[PDB]
Design an enzyme around this catalytic site. Structure first.
Site, mmCIF file in Angstrom:
data_model
loop_
_atom_site.group_PDB
_atom_site.id
_atom_site.type_symbol
_atom_site.label_atom_id
_atom_site.label_comp_id
_atom_site.label_asym_id
_atom_site.label_seq_id
_atom_site.Cartn_x
_atom_site.Cartn_y
_atom_site.Cartn_z
ATOM 1 N N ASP A 43 0.921 -1.301 -0.068
ATOM 2 C CA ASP A 43 0.076 0.118 -0.157
ATOM 3 C C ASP A 43 0.886 1.233 0.059
ATOM 4 O O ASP A 43 2.079 1.303 0.492
ATOM 5 C CB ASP A 43 -0.986 -0.046 1.251
ATOM 6 C CG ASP A 43 -2.137 1.203 1.122
ATOM 7 O OD1 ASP A 43 -2.944 1.129 0.195
ATOM 8 O OD2 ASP A 43 -1.942 2.128 1.961
ATOM 9 N N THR A 76 -4.911 7.960 -3.815
ATOM 10 C CA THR A 76 -3.787 9.096 -3.223
ATOM 11 C C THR A 76 -2.487 9.022 -4.039
ATOM 12 O O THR A 76 -1.947 9.943 -4.238
ATOM 13 C CB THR A 76 -3.722 9.003 -1.758
ATOM 14 O OG1 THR A 76 -3.157 7.533 -1.461
ATOM 15 C CG2 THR A 76 -4.791 9.013 -1.076
ATOM 16 N N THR A 77 -2.128 7.553 -4.131
ATOM 17 C CA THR A 77 -0.821 7.769 -4.999
ATOM 18 C C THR A 77 -0.914 8.093 -6.231
ATOM 19 O O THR A 77 0.028 8.486 -6.844
ATOM 20 C CB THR A 77 -0.419 6.099 -4.927
ATOM 21 O OG1 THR A 77 -1.382 5.141 -5.405
ATOM 22 C CG2 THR A 77 -0.157 5.756 -3.633
ATOM 23 N N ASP A 369 -14.780 -5.894 1.620
ATOM 24 C CA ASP A 369 -13.930 -4.933 0.848
ATOM 25 C C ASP A 369 -15.133 -4.562 -0.446
ATOM 26 O O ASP A 369 -15.027 -3.401 -0.812
ATOM 27 C CB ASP A 369 -12.663 -5.249 0.494
ATOM 28 C CG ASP A 369 -11.792 -5.307 1.766
ATOM 29 O OD1 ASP A 369 -12.108 -4.960 2.794
ATOM 30 O OD2 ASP A 369 -10.378 -5.312 1.401
#
Length: 505
Positions: A43, A76-77, A369
């Site tokens: 992650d 976010t990355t 998830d």
């Protein structure tokens, strides 16, 4: 000398460490400290929280990512890889006697115009159409990691998230709950109708099976009362010993009798009960139980429509609730009454079966998830062509708009469109295919009146459709990622120069 060069250069080093970790497949790079704890994680944000930064300016680019992680988490990355690209191009323009004020003016204007583009390129999908919902089901099962049975485990999830949706069309993750249990395969997970409890009685004396029965809710305890006013207990009669053992045992024989007279065949209390009282339940036929979680007593009455009661001293006939659906079934031995529903639940629980705990824990972390990635679509209802498929389309729309704006600021606008071509480049280098030799074909599809949901497949390795195979992501991720990067990278360019401030608190 220039100072600013060392600042923009430091940000590039942080992107390279997370540039190869994009997409499903990607190698990891551990940075163990001098302690000894060796940890590895793929992650993105997990690596940023544990990293020894060099210059203080690098913290500005990391703070903007922490705020976006708490909102959406994923994507976010994607804003860091674009930052390292648009900053490298600034050096090519800085040497052309271009002041930073003219470069920053391009990103602020190009970012605003992009907001009106994703709205038209995005696809509209309803939170009810099964023909389109089933297609999104197979999209998430392949992203996580469980292609052994993507047909059975996907169908059960379609009828779950689609049934727990409220009237307005929203849904939260608190309503979903996962469990684990041994079994013979992974196709036994089904759904009937009722409610399940996450705790079992710590005894084997009360009845175990009673067809056709009513549910009763209780919460009161049995501990000795306590007066508000202070007081002190003093004992001076040792004779008082062989009395309460029989007196206290009689106060429960008549209490449980009132429960049967009321018409309650099932009971779910909290505290314990003496042993003699349990023997009577076997002859009277009252499959009772104890030890129940507080959150469980709220879903019993909200699903079957029972009447929750808080006091046990008083129990009338009107306090009786109502059962949902009673059915027999063996659970690898003992046969209890476990049934769940999905029309109007509060904390639905799914019984995952398996041969070994290994495969159970893997699929266990997949069902929870699946509701998260899909829950956002049920609320917003707008999707795009993820997997780097939506960025290639913007490269053709920004160039046509750059011709309208004149002056020296048109150079920064074109660089922004080209900077977005790094998303498909990183995903291609990881697979071993030359990006320069495949990026020319994907653009051929978007030449005039071609499909807009086209992209590159990391599995097959050929140009295909995204909506057909399985590459979809929410809208707030891509829209906010481009906006967050625009306001996050400008803070690094507006810095005139370093300062030797003393006593910075």
């Amino acid at each position: 000398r220039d100072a600013q060069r060392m600042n923009i250069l430091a940000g590039r080093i942080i992107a390279e460490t997370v540039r190869s970790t994009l997409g499903p497949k990607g190698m990891d790079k551990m940075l163990v400290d001098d302690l000894g704890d060796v940890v590895v994680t793929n992650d993105g944000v997990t690596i940023l929280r544990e990293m020894s930064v060099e210059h203080p300016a690098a913290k500005m680019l990391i703070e903007v990512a922490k705020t976006q992680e708490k909102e959406v988490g994923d994507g976010t990355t994607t804003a860091v890889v674009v930052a390292g690209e648009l900053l490298r191009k600034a050096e090519e323009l800085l040497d052309q006697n271009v002041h930073p004020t003219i470069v920053v003016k391009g990103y602020q204007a190009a970012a605003q115009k992009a907001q009106e583009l994703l709205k038209t390129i995005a696809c509209e999908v309803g939170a009810q159409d099964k023909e389109i919902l089933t297609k999104i089901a197979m999209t998430s099962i392949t992203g996580k990691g469980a292609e052994k049975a993507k047909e059975k485990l996907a169908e059960i999830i379609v009828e779950a998230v689609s049934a727990v949706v409220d009237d307005e069309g929203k849904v939260d993750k608190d309503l979903i709950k996962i469990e684990k249990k041994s079994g013979a395969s992974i196709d036994d997970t089904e759904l009937i109708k009722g409610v399940l409890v996450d705790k079992e009685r710590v005894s084997a004396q009360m009845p175990k099976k009673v067809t056709d029965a009513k549910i009763a809710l209780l919460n009161c305890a049995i501990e000795i009362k306590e007066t508000e006013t202070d007081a002190e207990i003093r004992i001076t009669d040792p004779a008082k010993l062989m009395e309460f053992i029989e007196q206290e045992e009689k106060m429960l024989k008549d209490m449980v009798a009132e429960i049967k007279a009321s018409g309650a065949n099932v009971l779910f209390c909290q505290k314990g009960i003496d042993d003699l009282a349990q023997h009577y339940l076997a002859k009277e036929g009252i499959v009772a139980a104890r030890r129940v979680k507080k959150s469980d007593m709220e879903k019993l009455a909200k699903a079957t429509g029972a009447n929750v009661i808080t006091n046990i001293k008083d129990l009338s006939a009107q306090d009786l609730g109502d059962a949902g659906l009673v059915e027999e079934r063996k659970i690898s031995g003992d046969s209890m009454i476990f049934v769940e529903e999905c029309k109007h639940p509060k904390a639905v629980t799914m019984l995952i079966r398996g041969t070994t705990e290994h495969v159970i824990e893997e699929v266990a972390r997949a069902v929870d998830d699946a509701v998260g990635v899909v829950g956002c679509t049920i609320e917003d209802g707008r999707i795009v062509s993820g997997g780097g498929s939506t960025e290639v389309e913007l490269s053709m729309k920004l160039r046509e708009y750059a011709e309208g704006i004149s002056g020296r600021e048109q150079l920064a606008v074109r660089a922004f469109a080209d900077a977005l071509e790094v998303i498909p480049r990183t995903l291609a280098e990881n697979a071993g295919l030359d990006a320069i030799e495949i990026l020319v074909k994907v653009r051929a599809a978007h030449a005039s009146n071609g499909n807009k949901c086209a992209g590159l497949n990391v599995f097959t390795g050929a140009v295909e459709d995204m909506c057909e195979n399985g590459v979809v992501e929410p809208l707030r991720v891509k829209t906010q990622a481009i906006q967050s990067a625009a306001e996050s990278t400008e803070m690094l360019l507006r810095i005139d120069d370093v300062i030797a401030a003393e006593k910075l608190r």
